[PDB]
Design an enzyme around this catalytic site. Structure first.
Site, PDB file in Angstrom:
ATOM      1  N   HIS A   1       7.707 -15.388 -20.571  1.00  0.00           N
ATOM      2  CA  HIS A   1       7.567 -14.322 -21.492  1.00  0.00           C
ATOM      3  C   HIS A   1       6.672 -13.104 -20.850  1.00  0.00           C
ATOM      4  CE1 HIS A   1       6.170 -11.694 -24.579  1.00  0.00           C
ATOM      5  NE2 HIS A   1       7.041 -12.298 -25.525  1.00  0.00           N
ATOM      6  N   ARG A   2       7.782 -11.810 -20.610  1.00  0.00           N
ATOM      7  CA  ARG A   2       7.246 -10.699 -19.839  1.00  0.00           C
ATOM      8  C   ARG A   2       6.244  -9.957 -20.626  1.00  0.00           C
ATOM      9  NH1 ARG A   2      12.600  -6.578 -19.692  1.00  0.00           N
ATOM     10  NH2 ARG A   2      12.714  -6.307 -21.822  1.00  0.00           N
TER      11      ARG A   2
ATOM     12  N   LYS B   1      14.134  -2.875 -30.781  1.00  0.00           N
ATOM     13  CA  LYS B   1      13.222  -2.066 -31.088  1.00  0.00           C
ATOM     14  C   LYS B   1      12.479  -1.444 -29.658  1.00  0.00           C
ATOM     15  CE  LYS B   1       9.374  -5.183 -31.774  1.00  0.00           C
ATOM     16  NZ  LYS B   1       8.230  -5.739 -32.698  1.00  0.00           N
TER      17      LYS B   1
ATOM     18  N   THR C   1      10.139 -16.274 -33.496  1.00  0.00           N
ATOM     19  CA  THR C   1       8.756 -16.130 -33.144  1.00  0.00           C
ATOM     20  C   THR C   1       7.721 -16.644 -34.357  1.00  0.00           C
ATOM     21  OG1 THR C   1       9.317 -14.402 -31.411  1.00  0.00           O
ATOM     22  CG2 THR C   1       6.972 -15.065 -31.750  1.00  0.00           C
TER      23      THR C   1
ATOM     24  N   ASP D   1       3.627 -17.145 -29.946  1.00  0.00           N
ATOM     25  CA  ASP D   1       3.362 -15.665 -29.535  1.00  0.00           C
ATOM     26  C   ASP D   1       2.742 -15.689 -28.168  1.00  0.00           C
ATOM     27  OD1 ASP D   1       2.148 -12.854 -29.605  1.00  0.00           O
ATOM     28  OD2 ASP D   1       3.709 -12.693 -31.434  1.00  0.00           O
ATOM     29  N   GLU D   2       2.787 -14.451 -27.707  1.00  0.00           N
ATOM     30  CA  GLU D   2       2.331 -14.314 -26.085  1.00  0.00           C
ATOM     31  C   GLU D   2       0.816 -14.356 -25.889  1.00  0.00           C
ATOM     32  OE1 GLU D   2       4.339 -11.640 -27.430  1.00  0.00           O
ATOM     33  OE2 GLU D   2       2.537 -10.515 -27.812  1.00  0.00           O
TER      34      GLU D   2
ATOM     35  N   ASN E   1       0.828  -1.568  -0.029  1.00  0.00           N
ATOM     36  CA  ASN E   1       0.043   0.023  -0.247  1.00  0.00           C
ATOM     37  C   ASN E   1       0.904   1.101  -0.052  1.00  0.00           C
ATOM     38  OD1 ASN E   1      -2.676  -1.236   0.066  1.00  0.00           O
ATOM     39  ND2 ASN E   1      -2.212  -2.063   2.210  1.00  0.00           N
TER      40      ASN E   1
ATOM     41  N   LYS F   1       8.757 -20.649 -31.336  1.00  0.00           N
ATOM     42  CA  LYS F   1       7.919 -20.443 -30.121  1.00  0.00           C
ATOM     43  C   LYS F   1       6.691 -19.724 -30.891  1.00  0.00           C
ATOM     44  CE  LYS F   1       8.938 -16.770 -27.289  1.00  0.00           C
ATOM     45  NZ  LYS F   1       7.741 -15.891 -27.831  1.00  0.00           N
TER      46      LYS F   1
ATOM     47  N   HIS G   1      13.116 -13.177 -20.507  1.00  0.00           N
ATOM     48  CA  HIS G   1      13.280 -11.806 -21.486  1.00  0.00           C
ATOM     49  C   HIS G   1      13.715 -10.754 -20.540  1.00  0.00           C
ATOM     50  CE1 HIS G   1      11.507 -13.356 -25.344  1.00  0.00           C
ATOM     51  NE2 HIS G   1      10.940 -14.265 -24.402  1.00  0.00           N
TER      52      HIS G   1
ATOM     53  N   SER H   1      15.557 -10.470 -27.308  1.00  0.00           N
ATOM     54  CA  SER H   1      14.551 -10.549 -28.184  1.00  0.00           C
ATOM     55  C   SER H   1      13.954  -8.937 -28.586  1.00  0.00           C
ATOM     56  CB  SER H   1      13.494 -11.607 -27.865  1.00  0.00           C
ATOM     57  OG  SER H   1      12.562 -11.592 -29.151  1.00  0.00           O
TER      58      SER H   1
ATOM     59  N   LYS I   1       5.636 -15.917 -37.193  1.00  0.00           N
ATOM     60  CA  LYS I   1       4.862 -14.918 -37.551  1.00  0.00           C
ATOM     61  C   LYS I   1       4.046 -15.419 -38.806  1.00  0.00           C
ATOM     62  CE  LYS I   1       7.093 -12.272 -35.053  1.00  0.00           C
ATOM     63  NZ  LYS I   1       6.226 -11.285 -33.657  1.00  0.00           N
TER      64      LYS I   1
ATOM     65  N   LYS J   1       1.540 -12.992 -35.566  1.00  0.00           N
ATOM     66  CA  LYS J   1       1.055 -13.370 -34.326  1.00  0.00           C
ATOM     67  C   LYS J   1      -0.058 -14.349 -34.243  1.00  0.00           C
ATOM     68  CE  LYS J   1       2.181  -9.861 -31.472  1.00  0.00           C
ATOM     69  NZ  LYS J   1       3.467  -9.863 -30.932  1.00  0.00           N
TER      70      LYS J   1
HETATM   71  O1  LIG Z   1       6.263  -9.503 -30.027  1.00  0.00           O
HETATM   72  C1  LIG Z   1       7.252  -9.260 -30.390  1.00  0.00           C
HETATM   73  O2  LIG Z   1       7.685  -8.347 -30.656  1.00  0.00           O
HETATM   74  C2  LIG Z   1       8.351 -10.340 -30.099  1.00  0.00           C
HETATM   75  O3  LIG Z   1       7.913 -11.771 -30.822  1.00  0.00           O
HETATM   76  C3  LIG Z   1       9.696 -10.340 -30.939  1.00  0.00           C
HETATM   77  O4  LIG Z   1       9.369  -9.942 -32.375  1.00  0.00           O
HETATM   78  P1  LIG Z   1      10.218  -9.239 -33.565  1.00  0.00           P
HETATM   79  O5  LIG Z   1      11.567 -10.230 -33.296  1.00  0.00           O
HETATM   80  O6  LIG Z   1       9.473  -9.925 -34.797  1.00  0.00           O
HETATM   81  O7  LIG Z   1      10.413  -8.086 -33.052  1.00  0.00           O
HETATM   82  C4  LIG Z   1       8.992 -10.534 -28.795  1.00  0.00           C
HETATM   83  O8  LIG Z   1       7.651 -11.099 -27.994  1.00  0.00           O
HETATM   84  C5  LIG Z   1       9.504  -9.155 -27.914  1.00  0.00           C
HETATM   85  O9  LIG Z   1      10.829  -9.249 -27.883  1.00  0.00           O
HETATM   86  C6  LIG Z   1       8.761  -9.356 -26.392  1.00  0.00           C
HETATM   87  O10 LIG Z   1       9.285  -8.308 -25.719  1.00  0.00           O
HETATM   88  P2  LIG Z   1      10.459  -8.536 -24.458  1.00  0.00           P
HETATM   89  O11 LIG Z   1      11.669  -8.765 -25.259  1.00  0.00           O
HETATM   90  O12 LIG Z   1      10.740  -7.305 -23.997  1.00  0.00           O
HETATM   91  O13 LIG Z   1       9.859  -9.412 -23.603  1.00  0.00           O
HETATM   92  O1  LIG Z   2      -3.468  -1.395   5.243  1.00  0.00           O
HETATM   93  C1  LIG Z   2      -4.469  -0.293   5.356  1.00  0.00           C
HETATM   94  O2  LIG Z   2      -3.970   0.896   5.294  1.00  0.00           O
HETATM   95  C2  LIG Z   2      -6.102  -0.481   5.167  1.00  0.00           C
HETATM   96  O3  LIG Z   2      -6.194  -1.962   6.150  1.00  0.00           O
HETATM   97  C3  LIG Z   2      -6.724   0.443   6.034  1.00  0.00           C
HETATM   98  O4  LIG Z   2      -6.313   0.777   7.189  1.00  0.00           O
HETATM   99  P1  LIG Z   2      -6.994   1.878   8.196  1.00  0.00           P
HETATM  100  O5  LIG Z   2      -8.315   1.941   8.229  1.00  0.00           O
HETATM  101  O6  LIG Z   2      -6.323   1.672   9.605  1.00  0.00           O
HETATM  102  O7  LIG Z   2      -6.006   3.100   7.408  1.00  0.00           O
HETATM  103  C4  LIG Z   2      -6.347  -0.960   3.812  1.00  0.00           C
HETATM  104  O8  LIG Z   2      -5.874  -2.342   3.554  1.00  0.00           O
HETATM  105  C5  LIG Z   2      -6.214  -0.010   2.999  1.00  0.00           C
HETATM  106  O9  LIG Z   2      -7.301   0.920   2.679  1.00  0.00           O
HETATM  107  C6  LIG Z   2      -5.953  -0.648   1.404  1.00  0.00           C
HETATM  108  O10 LIG Z   2      -5.710   0.229   0.344  1.00  0.00           O
HETATM  109  P2  LIG Z   2      -7.076   0.310  -0.636  1.00  0.00           P
HETATM  110  O11 LIG Z   2      -8.151   0.990   0.120  1.00  0.00           O
HETATM  111  O12 LIG Z   2      -6.313   1.373  -1.724  1.00  0.00           O
HETATM  112  O13 LIG Z   2      -7.088  -1.357  -1.245  1.00  0.00           O
HETATM  113 MG   LIG Z   3       5.807 -12.459 -29.287  1.00  0.00          MG
HETATM  114 MG   LIG Z   4      -4.762  -3.850   5.453  1.00  0.00          MG
END
Ligand SMILES: O=C(O)[C@@](O)(COP(=O)(O)O)[C@H](O)[C@H](O)COP(=O)(O)O
Ligand SMILES: O=C(O)[C@@](O)(COP(=O)(O)O)[C@H](O)[C@H](O)COP(=O)(O)O
Ligand SMILES: [Mg+2]
Ligand SMILES: [Mg+2]
Ligand SMILES: [Mg+2]
Lengths: 467, 129, 467, 187, 129, 129
Positions: free
Chosen positions: C283-284, C323, C163, C193-194, C113, C191, C316, C368, C165, C167
């Site tokens: 894959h991120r 790019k 990858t 695609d995501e 929080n 591979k 990754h 990648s 192609k 997608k």
């Molecule tokens: O979707 C794409 O763009 C890719 O397939 C690359 O393709 P190209 O080789 O044709 O560009 C990968 O998934 C990315 O690299 C993912 O990003 P990251 O590496 O940040 O996870």
């Molecule tokens: O941890 C805290 O602060 C709380 O218990 C509130 O306590 P108090 O009532 O003692 O402040 C809640 O979990 C938050 O509201 C979570 O945020 P959100 O509402 O954005 O999910």
């Molecule tokens: Mg991809």
């Molecule tokens: Mg809480």
């Protein structure tokens, strides 16, 4: 257009100004800040490209599949009022790209790789339209607003809650004693903290036993159905199912789940809760990592839309007057997303698309974080009746005890609902109503003296652009 | 022994005049014509060696026939087939498949019987060539 | 200090300048931008407070548990060089607050929080120290760098990938044909695609069958062990286990998983992969939502540290010349996090804490996104040997075909490794080595003419502060 | 759409064709055609393979697939039943099939039939070089018997199994879920 | 047909001057150089016949080359490879692997398809030689 | 290639004088001497073709040697072994087993690798002869 070489996304066929989106199309808004030199039309087409069926160079395999149907199309780009270098971009996606009944697949397509692009400085997902064809594939929330209130037999006012303080430290025996004193005082719910799981000082299976004895003892002495949000958040799914099955075995009304666990893990409990008659509570932990910034991330209204489709009965939406970030008009937007069956386009509240949910259960929003008895008139005016108000510090931090703190908040709320229905204005006369109730109620008078001038006022980061 | 994998198998071997007429039907409807060859003509064997890239935008049946005669010179003792590929909204698949050139002698298949649980048999089809 | 009322976090006992952290303490850095009027000491203590055992008002239940042990302590605050109003804050957490073998519990505490606080404008988690006591509770990656290379029998160079192609769009029959032409040409991996999962155009169980026939046909004709990253990402865990069990049943080497699914869902597959002899690829997707911004979010090096503990073999990490967003020195930081067993403090590479992994398996990083044969000399100089290079567009987008594109990238890499080991400088002579190899290799010459001047150069957003 | 359950044929028929036919004020009523919205069709999974999916499995393109029903309908023992199947598939037919009334009669047990036709399929497949199939009838009294017949059909390595319409839409939707999760074509 | 198992496979066959340069890199970083040979070049076949013991403490690239020429005389029609072994805290594995001598004609692989449950196939790769 | 199935395999081939001495030990302890032959010398292959009935009550080592020379004339290119059988309360099994005659050239074993679930391999050993 199929020869080997690098071509621009606008030239490749992703931008079309004359395109009108169909009723069966997933629409997405993007608040794009392009780099110095990059055209907003090219910036839109780059987002429209990679989120569907595009790569940096042209492939011959595109001629195999019918690309005219699979490609996402950006249809209009408008500049954001107020900001000199920021643009709204409307991207249309076809249902052929999305898996039926999967949040994980929807996010893998739209918010996949478009954020990490070099030609864009900062991109933010503002709002998303779901067609009637797409919402019906999802089950929705296990109970809803209607289903939950019938189970607890509580109608006509917000449900009251309190977080067990302190966050970490208390042993199984003492943890239940705070729960017992809270529920008997007047509170409808007590809860576990988001970080509390299975720490070395107190095991989960011990906590579950001692709170359930405290629930039933409070239920016998008040005559009301009481509950405790049991935290099931675990490392693995095998541990997570075992915690839920034991919670059912004790006869708990409602269990809580953190947002961190992931949409794939969330959808699994939603299937489980419906098949075992359980109410699901969502705590948004680590949401502010990608929500708070106005220029970059994903707006909470989109996350709330996904969580409604995933299937959660409770969701923290935020407090306008609380200790945490929230703007009154923008907060009301999140409340309308999870409650209203059909919401119209309203620019001050941050709604851009006309969303039709088509008979999906209503998610009950939870207001929590730095609120007390003095804030009661502002909370009832902004939201309404179908909400959950949680007083973590405002109940236990009472000078008299826990029972008095729970009575003080209950008397304050009951006095406001009675005044509102009679015809008195709760916005102006609000403070006077609470003072008049303090004449006969002694715990309420002590609560108002402690937190009278204490107010959290700061400049909101996530604000509207049409004010 | 004769492998009947594909269309026009029971009919006698197609002449160049007949092949040109069949390709003309494929190009008229708007299909991509591709040549494929293999020495392993197993049933359910999916992927054959492609002779270059499929002819997507070619409005002449004679142009395919030049590539067919070029493939015959390179691979005399191989199964050459023509695959017509549909590129519509729902199909996105092969529509026509027929062997145009088959080797001097067709290889037979040997079946090996592996005895498992009960009376169930796992079958293994293998080409002698 | 236990009477009813609102007290400041510094006065409550969360800031201590003379505090020296123990060897068994989880350390966290925070790049905090405080609001106008808010003191950096108060800003640090607010982060140190809510992340452990604090609420806005004082409770009497604090006297029950021994608070001096459970409270997180901020020990030093230093101003960030370059920026006028930004501060580094070092927060120490005790092991008593964390569950053994759970990523979800760790994130619920630290990044819970603290982000959504009103007194802070923007907070970013820079780096995190894990003690030896905490890393041993986790299993780690299923195979690692050592375990994977022994299975594939491939040593002395980066593993090549591509990858498939486009997608989305390709049917089950045609999808395997692209895979077959890729692997036979010279690629080690193909591979999914995501976003590809179980769309209406092509079902997952059909895809799994047709690619495995393509893998084995390529394996017989080349004499190498080939693989395809099979995407198992699903809506529920029940669907996800069924996809993995069928992938094992076919005899696949390696399966891929998206980051969206959640850490709770990730740790479940890590347990499954070890117990069924499978290599896990991460894959991120949607990482750039909370990573790209320098002022707010979580740095990828912290996410990489969590993913190593969760148990993933591939990750990754990014390309400096590609790019997508990435700065050369900051990128090398992510590579050192997932490969090196013990890494020292280095401020240009973004490492702030001395991390000791104590015999956890080495995660193989994947480069990648927008790379080709012309970028080969820069990739080998920056990272090394134990990497995976993926050419999605640079293989299929080749004018001659897919087989020629796969040969072009393989010849380019083999020429560079041979030149590097002989004693030739690959940074300066790099372009000349690729030109000299093009005399005998015809597919490489065509690849260099297509993507010779095509280079993605933009200002990096996530940069170092000590340069 | 508020009246219909998501992904259920049985619920759709219980509403529309429920009690309207047996009305006294009507002499004769007939249901001619029905429109389904895009919102309602997406709740259903659809056919396991389709036209595209099936033809890719059998590697047969450009003409209708040929079939033959094993004659006579009832009477043939397990040994002789496979002999008719063997002579059919080797001659040039793509498919042979069980008759709709053939299940598990006293003269020939189902588990015996399943074994002998699969030997006939593979012998024909080796001699022609084509992927051959036999529509194996799984129609049974109970669902417990019906799943056991299907699982044994998968265990032998059959391409396609057949089902009668009589068994009911609730029973039909159960096999459709099963066939997708085990790579089977449904007839 | 050419078996591409190992590094420098797509490049032309390495001369003795090039091999000596590659071993010099391995000995410079501190790796143990070992020679291995086989007549069965199956994929995922782990253990090849070792030519003596690995050279742990040898600071001369010429010393490896003598053992390489000795192995070629003993086994002319076999796949000879060089394996560089790392002996650090975390690695403890092979770092470099490349075929230096391959036979006059490379053997092909036959794939046998065993039909199991559903549409699943067990694959068996076998060497013709 | 040399199949080492049984005792005295690593030692050089046993002469008739040495075999007579080994049988004398078996008959002295009271074991039944039996001759067995096969052309399929697979590992874990249990049953070989018996040359008549086992010699239970024979108190002469020369009598076994006559039957051994008779078996060599009938089967020249086969693996002949001697099996000494114990007939006591607890044993009731073979005690000694050694190959006395092996063919001119020993057949090699080919190993076929079937890929199943995960990384598990089913192995099949087959004799070339
Ligand atoms: O979707 C794409 O763009 C890719 O397939 C690359 O393709 P190209 O080789 O044709 O560009 C990968 O998934 C990315 O690299 C993912 O990003 P990251 O590496 O940040 O996870
Ligand atoms: O941890 C805290 O602060 C709380 O218990 C509130 O306590 P108090 O009532 O003692 O402040 C809640 O979990 C938050 O509201 C979570 O945020 P959100 O509402 O954005 O999910
Ligand atoms: Mg991809
Ligand atoms: Mg809480
Ligand atoms: Mg009939």
């Amino acid at each position: 257009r199929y020869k080997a070489g690098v071509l621009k996304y606008a030239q490749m066929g992703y931008w079309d100004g004359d395109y009108v989106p169909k009723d069966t199309d997933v629409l997405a808004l993007f608040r794009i800040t392009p780099q110095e030199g990059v055209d907003p039309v090219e910036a839109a087409a780059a987002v429209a490209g990679e989120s569907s069926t595009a790569t940096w160079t042209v492939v011959w395999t595109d001629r195999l599949t019918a690309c005219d149907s699979y490609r996402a199309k950006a249809y209009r780009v408008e500049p954001v009022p107020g900001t000199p270098g920021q643009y709204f971009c409307y991207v249309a996606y076809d249902l052929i790209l999305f898996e039926e009944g999967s949040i994980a697949n929807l996010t893998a397509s739209i918010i996949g790789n478009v954020f990490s692009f070099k030609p864009l400085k900062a991109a933010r997902l503002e709002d998303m339209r779901f067609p009637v064809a797409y919402v019906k594939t999802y089950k929705g929330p296990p109970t809803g607003i209607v289903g939950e209130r019938e189970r607890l037999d509580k109608f006509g006012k917000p449900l009251l809650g309190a977080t067990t303080k302190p966050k970490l430290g208390l042993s199984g025996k003492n943890y239940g004693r705070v729960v017992y004193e809270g529920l008997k005082g007047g509170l409808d719910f007590m809860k576990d903290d988001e970080n509390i799981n299975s720490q070395p000082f107190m095991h989960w299976r011990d906590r579950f036993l001692y709170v359930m004895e405290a629930v039933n003892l409070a239920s016998a002495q008040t005559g009301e159905v009481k509950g405790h949000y049991l935290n099931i958040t675990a490392g693995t799914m095998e541990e997570m199912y075992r915690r839920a099955e034991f919670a059912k075995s004790l006869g708990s009304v409602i269990v809580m789940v953190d947002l961190i666990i992931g949409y794939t893990a969330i959808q699994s409990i939603s299937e489980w809760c419906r098949q075992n008659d359980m109410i699901l509570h969502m705590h948004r932990a680590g949401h502010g990592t990608y929500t708070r910034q106005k220029n970059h991330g994903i707006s909470f209204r989109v996350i709330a839309k996904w969580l409604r489709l995933a299937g959660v009965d409770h969701l923290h939406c935020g407090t306008a007057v609380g200790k945490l970030e929230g703007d009154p008009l923008t907060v009301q937007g999140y409340y309308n997303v999870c409650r209203e069956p059909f919401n119209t386009v309203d620019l001050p509240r941050g709604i851009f698309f006309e969303q039709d949910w088509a008979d999906l259960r209503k998610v009950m929003p939870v207001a929590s974080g730095g609120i007390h008895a003095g804030q009661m008139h502002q909370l009832l005016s902004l939201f309404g009746d179908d909400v959950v108000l949680q007083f973590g510090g405002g109940t236990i931090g009472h000078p008299m005890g826990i029972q008095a703190g729970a009575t003080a908040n209950r008397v304050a709320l009951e006095a406001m609902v009675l005044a509102r229905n009679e015809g008195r204005n709760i916005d102006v006369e609000g403070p006077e109503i609470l003072r008049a109730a303090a004449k006969w109620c002694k715990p309420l008078e002590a609560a108002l003296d402690t937190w009278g001038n204490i107010t959290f006022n700061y400049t909101s980061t996530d604000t509207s652009d049409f004010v | 022994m004769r492998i009947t994998q594909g269309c026009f198998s029971f009919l006698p071997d197609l002449t160049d005049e007949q092949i040109s007429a069949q390709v003309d039907y494929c190009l008229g409807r708007g299909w991509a014509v591709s040549l494929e060859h293999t020495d392993d003509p197993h049933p359910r064997n999916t992927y054959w060696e492609m002779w270059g890239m499929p002819m997507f935008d070619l409005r002449d049946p004679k142009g395919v026939m030049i590539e067919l005669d070029e493939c015959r010179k390179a691979w005399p003792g191989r199964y050459i087939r023509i695959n017509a590929f549909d590129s519509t909204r729902g199909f996105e698949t092969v529509t026509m498949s027929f062997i145009v050139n088959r080797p001097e002698v067709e290889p037979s298949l040997r079946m090996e019987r592996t005895e498992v649980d009960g009376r169930s048999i796992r079958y293994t089809h293998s080409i002698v060539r």
